[PDB]
Design a protein around this ligand. Structure first.
Ligand SMILES: *[C@@H]1O[C@H](CO)[C@@H](O[C@@H]2O[C@H](CO)[C@@H](O)[C@H](O)[C@H]2NC(C)=O)[C@H](O)[C@H]1NC(C)=O
Ligand SMILES: *[C@@H]1O[C@H](CO)[C@@H](O[C@@H]2O[C@H](CO)[C@@H](O)[C@H](O)[C@H]2NC(C)=O)[C@H](O)[C@H]1NC(C)=O
Ligand SMILES: *[C@@H]1O[C@H](CO)[C@@H](O[C@@H]2O[C@H](CO)[C@@H](O)[C@H](O)[C@H]2NC(C)=O)[C@H](O)[C@H]1NC(C)=O
Ligand SMILES: *[C@@H]1O[C@H](CO)[C@@H](O[C@@H]2O[C@H](CO)[C@@H](O)[C@H](O)[C@H]2NC(C)=O)[C@H](O)[C@H]1NC(C)=O
Ligand SMILES: *[C@@H]1O[C@H](CO)[C@@H](O[C@@H]2O[C@H](CO)[C@@H](O)[C@H](O)[C@H]2NC(C)=O)[C@H](O)[C@H]1NC(C)=O
Ligand SMILES: *[C@@H]1O[C@H](CO)[C@@H](O[C@@H]2O[C@H](CO)[C@@H](O)[C@H](O)[C@H]2NC(C)=O)[C@H](O)[C@H]1NC(C)=O
Ligand SMILES: *[C@@H]1O[C@H](CO)[C@@H](O[C@@H]2O[C@H](CO)[C@@H](O)[C@H](O)[C@H]2NC(C)=O)[C@H](O)[C@H]1NC(C)=O
Ligand SMILES: *[C@@H]1O[C@H](CO)[C@@H](O[C@@H]2O[C@H](CO)[C@@H](O)[C@H](O)[C@H]2NC(C)=O)[C@H](O)[C@H]1NC(C)=O
Ligand code: NAG
Ligand code: NAG
Lengths: 147, 120, 117, 49
């Protein structure tokens, strides 16, 4: 319930989050991959406002949504818009990038991202020196996997 | 001739007899009545609610990000729902934050286990 | 997983770090009293991945290197408890050129002052 | 358990040892990008208890 803002200049030890962090160039504050995802799934109708003057005529028989509405079948719009869901996901990303897991348990406590990766390498039984000694290689592998 | 969904927004009749009516599929008309306070949301035309610029937590979900509530004379207000407080983490490549104290929290979680057994 | 044990699953039993839970019976249901540990009163410190002492990287055994501006300590992660950096708090791995962010400080040795006596 | 933490549950968040996950919003759904650690280039050794 805290909308964490994305840090201004991204210095994450060589890890690149550009593809998944919100994009202000676009009308929606959606990331690149979120746009790829929204172009894949096609919906029955976008807008939830189809007016009577639009269904007037043989467009009623031709369009499926008009035929549904003329028989009493309505599709109600969701309460959260897609922009709001995108703000929630960007808050989750900004909390997990800058504070590790701490923001889920209380107040977000900042920590350098490579130090958080060292924590997580400890979490799977690999000593943190492995991460600090292969930092660049690991960041490159992550970047290519995201790509 | 008949077309378009209609929803009525009410505080409790115990509280008031004012209502706001939402005409999905109308772009403000095919309305039962119009007056002041005509507000066009993405869920339809809302008639009878005053649109404010603040943002609050949702009280009565209208749809497409709009909520309504009965706030102060009294009236029905419509607003964009607030997702929460905007926050920011003071992140840098060598700063850390360590807790120096703590709280012992005790929270409740309610779960249904069974329902009524019935025979006919 | 929460009355008969301590769960590490995040937010499975309360918000915070789960300590224990207590079941209470309700009508047609159950009520869990989740006791969690919530960190409080954070404070900012300067930190570092490793530490150069003698051309070797020193990583903390458990905890993080923090400094109050002038002196460097190692503290556990969820509660501020600074301690003097020592070959018990740390372990060595390789020389200094590889770690980015390494910091120059001294790593005390508990044996050194004693055996001389 | 995977964006707000690191999960030890096997195959709950990706195949491998879970490091972290990133949520992405999709239409009517959610997409998780599970980052895992996958061991590679094994080599045989002689061992002893
Ligand atoms: C993060 O990755 C993006 C691409 O995924 C990088 O953007 C590219 O930057 C190079 C040189 O700056 C350009 O030649 C490419 O055309 C860019 N691609 C796109 C699509 O933007 C970005 O620079 C990376 N971030 C960092 C800090 O390296
Ligand atoms: C109600 O109608 C108005 C116009 O009659 C719509 O506003 C237009 O939206 C389109 C989006 O494709 C824009 O290209 C136009 O420039 C807008 N026109 C104006 C006057 O701004 C509005 O979107 C409709 N309402 C809803 C929620 O469907
Ligand atoms: C940690 O927090 C507790 C509060 O939960 C602090 O205890 C309080 O101490 C002040 C004076 O220091 C008293 O006036 C309060 O009545 C105490 N509260 C309780 C519930 O005992 C404690 O001092 C804090 N510790 C630190 C490190 O500051
Ligand atoms: C840790 O450091 C940051 C950075 O100084 C502090 O955050 C700033 O707090 C001031 C208020 O004194 C704000 O005006 C700034 O906008 C905040 N952030 C930035 C980016 O500078 C933060 O309060 C410190 N935390 C603690 C617990 O001391
Ligand atoms: C950082 O912590 C150290 C140790 O707690 C502080 O150094 C001590 O400061 C006290 C108070 O004057 C002295 O009595 C001790 O003799 C100091 N120890 C040593 C060996 O220096 C240090 O002052 C703290 N630094 C800051 C700026 O907070
Ligand atoms: C943390 O970031 C700062 C800048 O954000 C880094 O400071 C740079 O250090 C290099 C040393 O080669 C200098 O050439 C740059 O001019 C410095 N930048 C600025 C603007 O001060 C610092 O090195 C980084 N530390 C870590 C942990 O990598
Ligand atoms: C940390 O200490 C090391 C050695 O104790 C410093 O490395 C020396 O740096 C000087 C000047 O760059 C060189 O002339 C020496 O040859 C270096 N010694 C070795 C063995 O590397 C290092 O610069 C110190 N770091 C800081 C920022 O003080
Ligand atoms: C570990 O040792 C086994 C046994 O030598 C290797 O498995 C054999 O690989 C050869 C190919 O050179 C096959 O022809 C054999 O059938 C394999 N098994 C057996 C039962 O001998 C295995 O390749 C070695 N692993 C590594 C990574 O060196
Ligand atoms: C709701 O009903 C109760 C009992 O009928 C009444 O006491 C209360 O004043 C009513 N609420 C309001 C705000 O009018
Ligand atoms: C809300 O803000 C907009 C621009 O910020 C302004 O045009 C409009 O008059 C405001 N509405 C109210 C109720 O004051």
């Amino acid at each position: 319930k805290q909308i964490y803002k994305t840090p201004p200049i991204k210095d994450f030890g060589g890890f690149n989050f550009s593809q998944i962090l919100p994009d202000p160039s676009k009308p929606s504050k959606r990331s690149f991959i979120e746009d790829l995802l929204f172009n894949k799934v096609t919906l029955a109708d976008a807008g939830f406002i189809k007016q009577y003057g639009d269904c007037l005529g043989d467009i009623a028989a031709r369009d499926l949504i008009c035929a549904q509405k003329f028989n009493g079948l309505t599709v109600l719009p969701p309460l959260l818009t897609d922009e709001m869901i995108a703000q929630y996901t960007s808050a989750l990303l900004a909390g997990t990038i800058t504070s590790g897991w701490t923001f889920g348990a209380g107040a977000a406590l900042q920590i350098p991202f490579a130090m958080q990766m060292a924590y997580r390498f400890n979490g799977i039984g690999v000593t943190q020196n492995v991460l600090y000694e292969n930092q660049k290689l690991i960041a490159n592998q992550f970047n290519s996997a995201i790509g | 001739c008949s077309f378009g969904g209609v929803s009525v927004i009410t505080p409790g009749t115990n509280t008031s007899n004012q209502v706001a009516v939402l005409y999905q599929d109308v772009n403000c008309w095919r309305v039962y009545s119009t007056g002041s306070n005509v507000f066009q949301t993405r869920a339809g035309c809302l008639i009878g609610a005053e649109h404010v610029n603040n943002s609050y937590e949702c009280d009565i979900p209208i749809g497409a990000g709009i909520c309504a509530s009965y706030q102060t004379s009294q009236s029905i207000i419509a607003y964009t729902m607030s997702l929460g407080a905007e926050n920011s983490v003071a992140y840098s490549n060598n700063s850390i934050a360590i807790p120096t104290n703590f709280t012992i929290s005790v929270t409740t979680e309610i779960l249904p286990v069974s329902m009524t057994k019935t025979s006919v | 997983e929460c009355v008969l044990g301590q769960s590490k699953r995040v937010d499975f039993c309360g918000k915070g770090y789960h300590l224990m839970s207590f079941p209470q019976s309700a009508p047609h249901g159950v009520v869990f009293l989740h006791v969690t540990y919530v960190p409080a009163q954070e404070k900012n410190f300067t930190t570092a991945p490793a530490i150069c002492h003698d051309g070797k990287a020193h990583f903390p055994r458990e905890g993080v290197f923090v400094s109050n501006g002038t002196h460097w300590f190692v503290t556990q992660r969820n509660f501020y408890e600074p301690q003097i950096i020592t070959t018990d708090n740390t372990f060595v791995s390789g020389n200094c050129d590889v770690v980015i962010g390494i910091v120059n400080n001294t790593v005390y040795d508990p044996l050194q002052p004693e055996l001389d006596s």
